[PDB]
Design a protein around this nucleic acid. Structure first.
Length: 229
DNA sequence: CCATATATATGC
DNA sequence: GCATATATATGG
């Protein structure tokens, strides 16, 4: 009853995981500041575990489905190639929609891997899983080597790809500061990151101009994937 | 209004 | 493969 997990708790929890990753140890803070409605720590912890196992299941299903679809598409593609080569089918004016184009589009397809959870729809299973792993990795990087002063965090000799056509002058140093920002305030907390005078990126973030919120999110994902290898 | 997220077409 | 702008959807 009073400890029941409804849609509002599910959606608040989901959004909090996307900001903080594995937040089981900070439930007390998150309830106290209004991020999560009041429920027991145990219930929120159970719900976290359930939501992450459902994400894992959703991703594993999609991997399996995609694999089988591709295997079948490969065979038709292979059968279509031998006819083109044996001359049975004319290479000189093929339909837009053919076995090779079906295979190619499926291969390059990038679509959200989504599931419904306790009556809340369209939770992104990949986003959940990668954000938890990414934020764990980032926290460990900073707490292993820069625990006493996170502002000293360095990418070292790792050289990330440069941003393309950003409206601000954005270098490796800003990448470092963005990541320290994420460690301090959470993923998606771009206003707080922008406004922190210690981070020196107040004039470099644009919340037309690039980067906005979406570009910053993509850049953090890239950087943490890049560091993790 | 604000926000984030996604399918899509396009370029890199 | 990813990055982006656009149009569009949906929660706040």
């Amino acid at each position: 009853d009073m400890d029941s997990i409804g849609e509002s708790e599910v959606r608040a929890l989901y959004k909090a995981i996307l900001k903080f990753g594995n937040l089981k140890e900070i439930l007390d803070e998150l309830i106290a500041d209004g991020t999560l409605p009041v429920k027991s720590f145990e219930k929120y912890g159970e719900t976290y575990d359930e939501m992450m196992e459902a994400a894992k299941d959703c991703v594993h299903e999609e991997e399996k489905n995609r694999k089988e679809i591709l295997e079948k598409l490969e065979k038709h593609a292979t059968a279509y190639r031998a006819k083109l080569k044996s001359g049975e089918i004319k290479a000189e004016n093929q339909p837009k929609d053919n076995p090779l184009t079906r295979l190619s589009l499926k291969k390059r397809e990038k679509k959200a891997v989504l599931f419904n959870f306790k009556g809340v729809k369209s939770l992104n299973a990949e986003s959940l899983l990668s954000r938890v792993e990414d934020l764990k990795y980032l926290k460990n990087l900073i707490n292993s080597n820069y625990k006493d002063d996170p502002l000293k965090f360095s990418l070292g000799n790792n050289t990330p790809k440069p941003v393309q056509n950003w409206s601000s002058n954005w270098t490796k140093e800003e990448d470092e500061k963005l990541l320290i920002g994420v460690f301090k305030y959470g993923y998606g907390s771009w206003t707080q990151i922008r406004d922190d005078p210690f981070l020196g990126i107040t004039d470099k973030i644009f919340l037309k101009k690039v980067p906005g919120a979406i570009h910053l999110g993509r850049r953090v994902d890239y950087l943490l994937s890049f560091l993790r290898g």
